[PDB]
Design a protein around this ligand. Structure first.
Ligand SMILES: Nc1n[nH]c2cccc(Cl)c12
Length: 118
């Protein structure tokens, strides 16, 4: 059965390499698809800098920091928050990046996270 949190190492992708630039067309769909890709090992992370979000597709799925002393086993505790037309669905901490499908792009790094499944 599902533990509340799972340790994952996410590939960090450069925005110009990403082939599939979002998870879907509604807040509920992108959160659902992001969770499925995380379970399947087919999710990447793009770090947000100027110019990144306009090169990706809304709705966005962000991973955000969920606490301050929980970095168990070297993995930052995180949760999912979606954004569409400037409104956020969830409230959480600082953004670590934006999640996208991973379809074989070569990463530049890995980001260790402890992900709250729901
Ligand atoms: N990463 C995940 N492994 N297993 C899951 C089940 C539900 C939701 C998620 Cl995100 C996961």
């Amino acid at each position: 059965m599902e533990k509340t949190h799972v340790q994952l190492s996410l590939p960090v992708l450069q925005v110009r390499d990403v082939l599939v630039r979002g998870f879907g067309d509604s807040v509920e769909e992108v959160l659902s698809e992001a969770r499925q890709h995380l379970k399947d090992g087919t999710c990447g992370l793009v770090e947000v800098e100027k110019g990144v979000l306009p090169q990706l597709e809304q709705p966005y799925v962000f991973i955000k920091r969920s606490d301050a002393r929980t970095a168990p086993h070297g993995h930052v505790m995180v949760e999912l928050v979606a954004e569409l037309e400037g409104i956020q669905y969830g409230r959480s901490g600082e953004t670590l990046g934006v999640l996208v499908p991973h379809v074989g792009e070569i990463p530049v790094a890995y980001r260790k996270v402890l992900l709250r499944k729901n």
